[PDB]
Amino acid sequence: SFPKYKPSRLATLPATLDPAEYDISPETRKAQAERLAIRSRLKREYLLQYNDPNRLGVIEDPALIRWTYARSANIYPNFRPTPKTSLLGALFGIGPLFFWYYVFKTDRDKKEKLIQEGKLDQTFNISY
Amino acid sequence: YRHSIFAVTHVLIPVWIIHYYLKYHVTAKPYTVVERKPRIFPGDTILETGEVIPLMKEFPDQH
Amino acid sequence: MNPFASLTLTTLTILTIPIMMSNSNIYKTNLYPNYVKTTVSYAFTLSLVPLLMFMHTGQEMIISNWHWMTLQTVELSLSFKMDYFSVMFIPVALFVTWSIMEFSMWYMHSDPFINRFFKYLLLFLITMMILVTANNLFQLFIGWEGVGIMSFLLIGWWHGRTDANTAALQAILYNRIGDIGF
Amino acid sequence: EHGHSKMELPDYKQWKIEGTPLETVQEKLAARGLRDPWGRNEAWRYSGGFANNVSFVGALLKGFKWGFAAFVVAVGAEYYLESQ
Amino acid sequence: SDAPPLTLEAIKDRVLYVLKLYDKIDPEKLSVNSHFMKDLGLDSLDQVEIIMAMEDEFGFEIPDIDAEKLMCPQEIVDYIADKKDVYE
Amino acid sequence: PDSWDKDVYPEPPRRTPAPAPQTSLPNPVTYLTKIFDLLVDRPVTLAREFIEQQHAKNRYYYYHREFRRVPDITECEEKDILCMFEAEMQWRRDYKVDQEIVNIIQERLKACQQREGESYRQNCAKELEQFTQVSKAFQDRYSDLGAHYSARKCLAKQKQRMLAERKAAKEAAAA
Amino acid sequence: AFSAPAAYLTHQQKVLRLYKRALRHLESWCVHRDKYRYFACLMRARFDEHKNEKDMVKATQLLRQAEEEFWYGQHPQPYIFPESPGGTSYERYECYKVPEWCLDDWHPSEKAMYPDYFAKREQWKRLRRESWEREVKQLQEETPPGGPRTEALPPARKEGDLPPLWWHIVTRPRERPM
Amino acid sequence: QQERDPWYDWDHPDLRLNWGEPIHWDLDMYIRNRVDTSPTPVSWNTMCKHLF
Amino acid sequence: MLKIIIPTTMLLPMTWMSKHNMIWINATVHSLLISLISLSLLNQLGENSLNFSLTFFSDSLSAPLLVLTTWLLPLMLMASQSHLSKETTTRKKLYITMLILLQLFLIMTFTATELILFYILFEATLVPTLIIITRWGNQTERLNAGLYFLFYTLAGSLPLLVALVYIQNTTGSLNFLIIHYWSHPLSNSWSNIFMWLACIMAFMVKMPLYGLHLWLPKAHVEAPIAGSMVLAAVLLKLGGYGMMRITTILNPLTNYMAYPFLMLSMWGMIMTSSICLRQTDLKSLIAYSSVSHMALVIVAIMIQTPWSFMGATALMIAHGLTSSMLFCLANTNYERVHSRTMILARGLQTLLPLMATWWLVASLTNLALPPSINLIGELFIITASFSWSNITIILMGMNMMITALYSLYMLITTQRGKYTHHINNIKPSFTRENALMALHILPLLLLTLNPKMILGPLY
Amino acid sequence: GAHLARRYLGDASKEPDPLRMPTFPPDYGFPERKEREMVATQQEMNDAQLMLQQRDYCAHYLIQLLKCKRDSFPNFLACKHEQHDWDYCEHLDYVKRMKEFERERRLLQRKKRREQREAEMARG
Amino acid sequence: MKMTALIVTIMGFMLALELNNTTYYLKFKYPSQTYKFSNMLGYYPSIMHRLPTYHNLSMSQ
Ligand SMILES: CCCCCCCCCCCCCCCCCC(=O)OC[C@H](COP(=O)([O-])OCC(O)COP(=O)([O-])OC[C@@H](COC(=O)CCCCCCCCCCCCCCCCC)OC(=O)CCCCCCCCCCCCCCCCC)OC(=O)CCCCCCCCCCCCCCCCC
Ligand SMILES: CCCCCCCCCCCCCCCCC[C@@H](O)O[C@H](CO[C@H](O)CCCCCCCCCCCCCCC)COP(=O)(O)OCC[N+](C)(C)C
Ligand SMILES: CCCCCCCC/C=C\CCCCCCCC(=O)O[C@H](COC(=O)CCCCCCC/C=C/CCCCCCCC)COP(=O)(O)OCCN
Ligand SMILES: CCCCCCCCCCCC(=O)SCCNC(=O)CCNC(=O)[C@H](O)C(C)(C)COP(=O)(O)O
C-alpha cells in the first residue's frame, strides 16, 4: 500500500482515482452516450453556423446570454429575506464600517490627547 | 564615415546643448549645481589662497 | 566648466534619441536593432569619463536643473544625484545592456517584432537610469514604476500565451504590494 | 541562404549495442530472461564523438596546462628582470 | 531557429530509420504501408512504444487519442506532415 | 554670478587642492578635459557671445512690483467688508512671502548637506538651527488653519496662544 | 486532437494510457538512457504478466492499484515537450496567427502588391461558395434523424463533392505563421 | 478550466469551452489566469502542514 | 464671462440652420473654437478670484472644470457621429441641442457667484441628461435607469434648497464672497447637525457616496456614449465642486460629522475595487472604477487640508479625462461586436494594434502611473490622509493594489490571448476613433508638464 | 568561537557581556594607566572628511593612503606600503581590543575566585 | 575562519558531485518528503496562489 491522496476544494480528486468511473453499468453507458449526443448536436449546430460563407458578424451564444443575465439581472427577483441572508448582509455591510470607525476614532483620540499634553514632538511638521 | 556622422549628430550636438543649458541657465540660479567640496589632505596647497596645510605630528614609523 | 555634469546628463540624454526616432523611417527597416546597440555602446563609452573623474578626485554632484511644481514650503524639481553609486552603476548597466542587445540581434533574429523588442529594452534602460540617478523620492518612484511596467510588458511578450500574462500580472501584484510600503 | 544541401541519413546497420553500457544493460536483462527491443536505437549516443567523456575536475581544469606554462614563463621572465 | 525545412521524403526516411532500428522488426520485411498489428505481428504495447520512438525522434508529442489509431508507417508520416504543415 | 545675491545664499570660499603628480605616467583626465574643452566649451562660448551681443543690441527692462502697507485684520470693524477684504489680501501676500522664506532656508540646508559631504552632521549645525527656528515660527503662524484659512482664523489662533502664554507666565510668577 | 472522441474509454485504452504515462514518468525519473532502458524493460515485463488475464472484475482491480501506485510516484516535475500543453513554448506563436478573412479588409493599395495571391484567393472563395451549398444538403441527407450521436463528419462521396465543413480546417493560419 | 482536456478541439481553445454548453456560475474565477483546482502530487493538507 | 456663454448659446441657431449634412462639421469646429476661447480663464491669481461681475466669477478651481467641460463637447460629437448615422436630421439636431444645453448649464453652474443660482443650474443639468439617457439609449432598462438617476439626485437636492433659503434668512446673503468673509462657527446642535446633513448629502449623492452609488452603474451602462462621457467626466465633479464650495460654513461641525462618510468612502473604495474584479460587463467595470475614484475624492474633501484640496482637484480632472477615454474605447468595441461583454471579443491586439496601444495607455493612466496627474492627485490625497491618521495607509495601499489588478485584468481580457474564431466583422479602426483617443490622451500628458494649472485655489 | 559555547552552555557570570564591557575601572589592574595617543587633530581629519566610523586612532595612515590614491591616480597599484601600514595599525587596534577582552575576563574570574574564597572563609 | 567560505564551497561541490554521480547506478527509489518539499518550491506557490485569491475573488462576487 501507499499513502492515500486526500482531495480538497482547491486540489480536486484526480480523474483516474475516482471510485465512480470504475463502476460501469449499462445505465452509466447510456448516460455517457446521451451526453456525447447532446455535445455533438451542439457542435454540429455551431459548425453549421460557423462554416457558412454567407455569415457575417458574431454567432450569438444563448449560454453566454444566460450566464450574464443570471449573474446580473436575475439576482433580486430570486432574492428572499432569510436568516442566513440577513445575518450575512448585516455582518459584511456594517461590521467593517464600525470596526474601522472604532480604530480611527481611538487613534485620533490618542493623537489629540498627546498634542494637548504637548508630548508629540511635531517639529518640522509644516505640510498637512 | 557612418561613425563620423553618428558621433556628431548623436554625441556632439547633444553635449553642446546640455553644456550650454547647464552653464548659462541652470547655473544662473543659486544652489542648482552643488559640488562635493573636494578633500583637503595635509601638505596640499590651495590655488585660490596659495597657503599650505601644515604636516602631521611625525608619528613613530616602523614596519 | 567641469564636464562632470554635462557628461553625466548627456549619457542619459543620448540614451533617449532612438526612442525619439522610433516614429521615423529607420524604425521600419532592419537597421534599427544595430542603431540601438550602437547608441547604447556610445552611451557606455561616454559615461566611462565621469567614472574616471570620480576615481581620480572623488567628485560628487547634485544637478537640480528643472523646477517642477512647488507646493507651499515643499519644492519639487527635476534633480539628479551623481554620487559614487550612480557613476559606478551606470557604466556597468550600460555594458551589460550592450552585451544583451548584441546577443539579442542573434537570439531574436526570427521575431517579427524585433524593433519593438529593442525599443522595449531601451525604454527599460531609460527607466532604470531614472531610478538610479534620482535625487528625490518622486523621481525614484517614477523609475520604480517605469521598470515595473516595462517588466510587465516584456514578460508577457508572447501575449497569446496564457501563462505569460499570468506571470506578468503576478509580477505587477507583488510589486504593488511593495509599492504600498514605498 | 538556407541549409539546402540534401543531407543523407547514415546506415542503420552501423549502430551496434556492442561497446556501450547498453551491452551491460542487455547482460543484466538476460540474467532475468528479458531483452531490450530498442537497444540499437540509442547506440548513436555512444558511437561517434560522444564516445569519449570528461570528468568534472577535468572540465574545471579546461585550460590549466596552457595557463600554467604561461605562468611559469612570466614568473621566470620577472625573476630574471628584477634581478638586475 | 535556423531549422532546415524538412519535407515528406525526410519524414518518411526518419520514420523508416527508427522502425529499422526496432530489432523486433525484420528490416527487409517492413514497408511504408506495412501494417503493425497483422503484417508485423506486433502487440499494442509495441505500437505505443513505436509512438514513443516517433515522439522522441521528432521532438513533439502525439496525443493518445490520435496515436492509438496509427497502425501504418505511411499514415504516421501523413499525420506528422499534417501537424507540421509539410508542402511536398 | 551677479544674477543672485551672495548674502541670501552664502557659500564658503571653496578651497581646492593643487595637482601633485607623483608619477611621470600621464593621466587620462587632463587630456580628456582638454579635448572636451576644445571640442565643446569653445563653440558653446562663441554661440553665447553671439547671443549676448544680439541681446545687447535690444535692451529693455522690467520692474519688481511694490505694494503699500494696508491696515490688517485687527484694525477692521466687525462687518466693514472693504477693510476686511484689503486685510485678507495683505495677509495672503504675507503668507506667500513666508512660504518663500521657508523655501530659501530649506535650499540653504540642502546645499549645506550636499556641499559638506561626509561631515554634514557637524558642519551644517548652523543651517539646521536656522531652519528649526524658522519652521517653529511658521508652524506657530499657520499650522492648523486648514483649508478655508483666513486672516481671522490666524488672528484667533494667535489670540488663543497668547492667552495661554499670559496665563502660564502669570502662574509661574505667582507660583 | 484531430479525431473525434468516443463516448467512453475501454479497458484496454485505459491500460495503454497508463502504460504511456508510467513510461514517460519513469523516463523523467531516469535521466540517463541506459538506466531508463533497463527500468523500461522491467516495467514492460511487469505489465505483460497480467496480459492474458480474463476476469473482468480482477482486470478492474488491476490497473486501479496501478493508477494509485503511479500517483504516489509520479515525479512532481515531469518532462514536457516544449509545444505540449505544459511546455515552455505551448502557445508562443498563437499571437502571430491571424484569421484569413482579415485579408478581405485590406486596402486596394495593399492588394495591389501580391495580385497573384488574391487571384488564387478569389478562386478559393468561389470553390467554397459552391461547395458549401452542396455540403449543406449532403450533411442534411446523411445525418441520422433526431440529431448526430458522434461529432464525426462524413467524407465526400460524389465526384465534384468536397468534405463537409472543410473551409476552417483547411485554412488554418499555420503552425509558425511568423 | 485548467484541468479540462487540453487536447480536445474546443470552439474556444484558450478558454477551453464549447459553444452551446452551459457556463459555470464562477467561470471568470476559473479562466486559467486565476485560481485553478487541478490535483497536485501532494495532498493539500500535507502541503499546508509542511509549509506552516 | 459672457465671451464664453454667448458663443455657446449661438451654437444652437447655427446647429438648427446648418445644412442636413454639415451639422457635425459646424458643431465640431465651433465647439473647438469655444474651447480655445475658454482656455483664457486659466490665467488666475494668488489673490481672491477673477470676479467678472455680480453674477459670474472664476477661480483656479472653476477654471480647469470649465476648460474640461468645453473640451468634452467636440469629443462627444465625434463619438456620437457613428451610431446616429441612420437618424433623421431633426433628431440629430435635437441630440446636438441637448448636448449644447448641457454644456451651457455646466458653464453657468461652475461660475455661479450665488448659491441659489448654483442650485438652479445644478438641477437644470438634470433634464438634458435624463432626455439623452431615456431617448437615445439602446436597451429597455434605460427608462428604469433614468428614473433612478433622477430620483436619487432629487432625494438629496430638495432638502439642500430648504437649507439654502434658511441660511439666507439668517446670514442675509448667499453670495460666495460674503459667505466666506462673514463665516461664523457652527455650534454643535441638533439643528446645526441637520443643517450640515442637508447641505452635504445633496453633493454626496452625486459623487456618488458608496451607500448611494446604485444609480451610477445603471445610468452609465444604459446611456449612449456621449451620455456616459458627460456623466463620468463632468457630472460627477459637480458634487465635489459643491462640497468644496460649501464646507466653509460647516466648520467646526465637519470634524464630528465627517466620520460616517469617511468610513463609508474608505471601505467603499475597497468594496468597489473588489467588485471590479468580478465583472462580466465593461461599462459596469468602468462605472465602478469611477465610484472608487470619487470615493477617494470624497475622503480628500472631508479631511479638509490644503494638500487634500489640491489632490482632489487634480484627481477630478484626471479621472474625468481617463474615464471618458475608457468609455470611448469600450464603445468602439461595442459598435463592432454589439454585445458589450468582456469575455466574448478576445485577442483584439492582434487585429487592432493601434487600438491596443490606446487601451494600454488608458489602463496605465487609470492605474495611476507616475508622473501622471492621476498619480499626483492620488499621492497628495494619500499624504494628507496619512497626516490625518497613519492607519489609512493600509486601506489606500489595498485600493492601489486592487486598482492595478482590475485595470490590467480589463486590458488582458480584451486585448491579449487568442481571438474569437467566429467573430469576423471586426473592421480596421477608423481615423475618427483614433483621433478621438488621441484627443483624449494628449491633454493628460500635456497637463503632467504643468500640474499647477489643475491644483486648485490652494496651490 | 569557543567563548560563545562557554558562555551559553556554561554559566553567565564567568565571561563578560560585550555590550557592557568594561565593567571595571581602568587602573584597577595597574596604576600608571598610560593614555592612548592621537596623531590627526580635528581640523585636517575633518578636511579629509573620511567617515564617522573611519575616524579612529588609525586615521593618519588612512590619510596617507588617500593621499597616495589621489596623487598617483593612473597607477592604482603604486602606493602599497601605506595600505600595509593602515592594515597593520588596524591589526594593532584589534589586538588591543582582544587584550582588553581577555583582561576583563581574567579580572572577572579573579573577582569570582575572591568572592568564593571569602564565602568559604566565612563558612569555616 | 578565514577559509570557512572556501571549505564550505568545496564541501558543497564534492557532496553534490557525489550525490549526482549515483544517478548512473541501475537502482531506482521513490522520492522522500524533503525532495518533494524542495521541488514544489516549499509548496508556497501552490497554497498561496490558490487559497487567498479564491477567498478574495469569491467574496468579490
Ligand atoms: C560544525 C561542523 C561543520 C561541518 C558540518 C558537517 C559536515 C557535512 C555533513 C553532511 C550533512 C548533510 C549533508 C547531506 C545533505 C542531504 C543530501 C541527500 O542525501 O539528499 C538525498 C535525500 C533524499 O533524496 P531523494 O528523495 O531520494 O531524491 C531522489 C533523487 O536523488 C533526486 O535527485 P535529483 O537528481 O533530482 O537532484 C539531487 C539533489 C536533490 O536532493 C535533495 O532533495 C536536497 C534536499 C536535502 C539536502 C539539503 C540539506 C540542507 C539543509 C538545510 C536545512 C535548513 C533548515 C530547514 C528547517 C525545516 C523545518 C521543518 O541533491 C543535490 O543537488 C545536493 C543536495 C545538497 C547537498 C550539498 C549542500 C548541503 C550541505 C550543507 C548542509 C549543512 C552544512 C552547513 C555548512 C556550514 C557548516 C555549519 O535527502 C534527504 O534524505 C534529506 C537529508 C537531510 C534533510 C534535513 C531536513 C529534514 C527535516 C525533517 C523534519 C525535522 C523536524 C522539524 C520540526 C519542525 C516543526 C515545527
Ligand atoms: C444608506 C447608505 C448611507 C447613507 C448616508 C449615511 C450617513 C448619515 C449618518 C448621519 C451621522 C450620524 C447622525 C448624528 C451624529 C451625532 C453624534 C451621535 O451619534 O453621537 C452621540 C449621540 O447619542 C445618540 O446617538 C443620540 C441619537 C440616537 C438616535 C439616532 C439614530 C441612531 C441610528 C439611526 C441610523 C439611520 C440613518 C438613516 C436614516 C434613514 C453623542 O452623544 P451626545 O453627547 O448626547 O450628542 C451630541 C450631539 N448634541 C451635542 C447635538 C446633543
Ligand atoms: C440621498 C437621499 C438622502 C436624503 C437627504 C437626507 C439628509 C437631510 C436631512 C433631512 C432633512 C432636514 C432638512 C433641514 C433643512 C435645514 C434647515 C435647518 O437645519 O434648520 C433647523 C431645522 O432643523 C429641523 O427642523 C430638522 C427636522 C427634520 C424633519 C425631517 C426629518 C427627515 C428624516 C430625517 C432622518 C434621516 C437623518 C439622516 C439622513 C441621512 C441621509 C440618509 C433649525 O430649525 P429652527 O426651528 O428654525 O431653529 C430654531 C431652533 N433652534
Ligand atoms: C514511476 C511510476 C510508477 C507506475 C507504476 C505502474 C504500475 C505497473 C503495474 C501495472 C499492472 C498491470 O499490468 S494492470 C493489468 C490489467 N489487466 C489486463 O491487462 C488484462 C488484459 N489486458 C489487455 O487486454 C491489454 O489491452 C493488453 C493485452 C495488455 C494489451 O492489449 P493489445 O493487444 O490491444 O495491445
> Distance between CA J56 and CA J34 in Å, rounded?
18
Helices (H), I278-305: 282-303
Cell (9 digits) for I71:
473640451
Listed residue (E84, E86, E75) closest to E36, CA to CA:
E75
Indicate the burial class of I343 (C-beta count within 10 angstroms; 0-12, 13-18, 19 or more).
Answer: buried
Domains contained in chain E, CATH given:
8-84 (1.10.1200.10)
Q: Considering only CB atoms, which residues of chain G are within 8 Å of chain E?
A: 1-3, 5, 12-13, 16-17, 19-20, 23, 44, 47-48, 81-84, 174-175
Q: What type of residue sits at position K5?
A: A
For residues I266 and I354, is the Cβ–Cβ distance under 8 A?
no
Per DSSP, the three-state class of I56 is coil
Phi and psi at I71, nearest 5°, equal -70, -25
Listed residue (C127, C90, C121) closest to C103, CA to CA:
C121
> Distance between CA J22 and CA J32 in Å, rounded?
18
Contact J72 F123 (CB under 8 A): no
Q: How far is the CA of A88 from the centre of ligand 2 (A)?
A: 24
For residues E40 and E25, is the Cβ–Cβ distance under 8 A?
yes
CA distances from I113 to E62, I119, I173, J75 (A): 78, 11, 11, 77
CA distances from I69 to H43, I31, I100, I205, I227 (A): 60, 11, 11, 21, 13
Listed residue (G34, G30, G24) closest to G81, CA to CA:
G24
10 Å Cβ neighbour count for K28? 14
For residues J89 and J61, is the Cβ–Cβ distance under 8 A?
yes
Search chain J and give the residue with CA nearest F123.
J46
Contact H35 K50 (CB under 8 A): yes
> Distance between CA C127 and CA I278 in Å, rounded?
33
For residues I26 and I74, is the Cβ–Cβ distance under 8 A?
no
Contact G76 K39 (CB under 8 A): yes
For residues E14 and E57, is the Cβ–Cβ distance under 8 A?
yes
Q: What type of residue sits at position G150?
A: T
F137: part of which helix (H) or strand (E)?
helix F125-142
Per DSSP, the three-state class of I448 is coil
Cell (9 digits) for F17:
587642492
Q: What type of residue sits at position A117?
A: E
Helices (H), C58-161: 84-107, 115-133, 137-155
For residues I289 and I271, is the Cβ–Cβ distance under 8 A?
no
Q: Which residues contact ligand 1 via a Cβ below 6 A?
A: K 8, 12, 15-16, 19, 23, 29, 31-32, 34-35, 38
Indicate the burial class of G11 (C-beta count within 10 angstroms; 0-12, 13-18, 19 or more).
Answer: middle
> Distance between CA I143 and CA I134 in Å, rounded?
5
Q: What type of residue sits at position K23?
A: T
Contact F115 B36 (CB under 8 A): yes
Way the structure was solved? cryo-EM
Q: Does G102 touch chain I (CB under 8 A)?
A: yes
> Distance between CA C118 and CA C98 in Å, rounded?
11
Rounded to a whole number of angstroms, the CA Rg of chain K reads 20
For residues I301 and I243, is the Cβ–Cβ distance under 8 A?
yes
> Distance between CA I110 and CA I104 in Å, rounded?
10
Give every CB contact of residue J69 below 8 A, 6+ residues apart in sequence: J76, J79
Q: What type of residue sits at position G118?
A: F
DSSP string for G92-155? GGGGG---GGGGGGS-HHHHHSSHHHHHHHHHHHHHHHHHHHHHHHHHHHHSPTTS-SS-----
Search chain H and give the residue with CA nearest A13.
H39
Q: Which residues contact ligand 2 via a Cβ below 6 A?
A: I 188-190, 193, 211-212, 260
For residues G72 and A2, is the Cβ–Cβ distance under 8 A?
yes
Per DSSP, the three-state class of H28 is helix
**Partner residue opposite H37 with nearest CB, options A10, A62, A67:** A10
Give every CB contact of residue C113 below 8 A, 6+ residues apart in sequence: none
> Distance between CA A57 and CA F172 in Å, rounded?
89
Q: Does C165 touch chain H (CB under 8 A)?
A: yes
CA distance I384 to chain F (A): 11
Q: How many CA atoms lie within 13 A of E59 on its CB side?
A: 6
Q: Considering only CB atoms, which residues of chain C are within 8 Å of chain J?
A: 55-58
Contact G5 A36 (CB under 8 A): yes
Cell (9 digits) for I370:
507616475
Contact D40 E23 (CB under 8 A): yes
CA distances from A71 to A63, H21, I271, I282, I284 (A): 12, 17, 18, 14, 13
Listed residue (F97, F102, F77) closest to F87, CA to CA:
F77
F to J contact (≥3 Cβ pairs closer than 8 Å):
yes
> Distance between CA K29 and CA K36 in Å, rounded?
13
Q: Is C2 left (phi over 0), alpha (psi -120 to 50) or beta?
A: left
Positions of E annotated as catalytic residues are: 43
> Distance between CA E57 and CA F77 in Å, rounded?
100
> Distance between CA I441 and CA I431 in Å, rounded?
15
> Distance between CA H22 and CA A62 in Å, rounded?
9
Listed residue (D26, D43, G30, D57) closest to K22, CA to CA:
G30
The protein residue with its alpha carbon nearest to ligand 2, atom 22, reads I190
For residues I317 and I379, is the Cβ–Cβ distance under 8 A?
no
- What secondary structure letter does DSSP report for F40? I
Listed residue (F84, F61, F81, F54) closest to F71, CA to CA:
F84
**Burial call E34-69: b when 16+ CB within 10 Å, e when fewer:** bebeeebebebbbbbbbbbbbbeebebbbbbbebbe
> Distance between CA I316 and CA I322 in Å, rounded?
10
Give every CB contact of residue I332 below 8 A, 6+ residues apart in sequence: I355, I429, I433
- Resolution in Å equals 2.9
Query: Which ligand 2 atom is at minimum distance from the Cα of I264?
Result: 3
Indicate the burial class of K15 (C-beta count within 10 angstroms; 0-12, 13-18, 19 or more).
Answer: exposed
Q: What is the dihedral of CA G161, G163, G165, G167, to 10 degrees?
A: -80
- What secondary structure letter does DSSP report for C68? E
Contacts 24+ apart (CB under 8 A), D48-57: D56/K17
Query: Parallel, antiparallel, or unpaired: how do β-strands I50-51 and C74-81 relate?
Result: unpaired
> Distance between CA I55 and CA I116 in Å, rounded?
11
Phi and psi at F26, nearest 5°, equal -85, 125
Helices (H), I22-125: 23-38, 62-83, 89-111, 115-124
CA–CA–CA angle G145, G151, G154 (5° rounding): 75
Query: Parallel, antiparallel, or unpaired: how do β-strands I50-51 and B33-34 relate?
Result: unpaired
Chain B environment of F12 (Cβ under 8 Å): 37
In the sheet that B33-34 helps form, which strands lie side by side, from edge to edge?
B33-34, C62-71, C74-81
> Distance between CA I157 and CA I159 in Å, rounded?
6
- Find residues 121-160 of chain C whose CB sits inside 8 Å of chain I: 138, 141-142, 145, 149, 152, 156, 159-160
For residues I73 and I8, is the Cβ–Cβ distance under 8 A?
no
> Distance between CA I198 and CA H11 in Å, rounded?
57
β-strand partners of B46: F17
> Distance between CA I57 and CA I60 in Å, rounded?
11
> Distance between CA I336 and CA I358 in Å, rounded?
17
Give every CB contact of residue I21 below 8 A, 6+ residues apart in sequence: none
> Distance between CA I318 and CA C177 in Å, rounded?
24
DSSP string for C12-38? HHHTSHHHHHTTSGGGGSTTHHHHHHH
> Distance between CA I159 and CA I162 in Å, rounded?
5
10 Å Cβ neighbour count for F173? 7
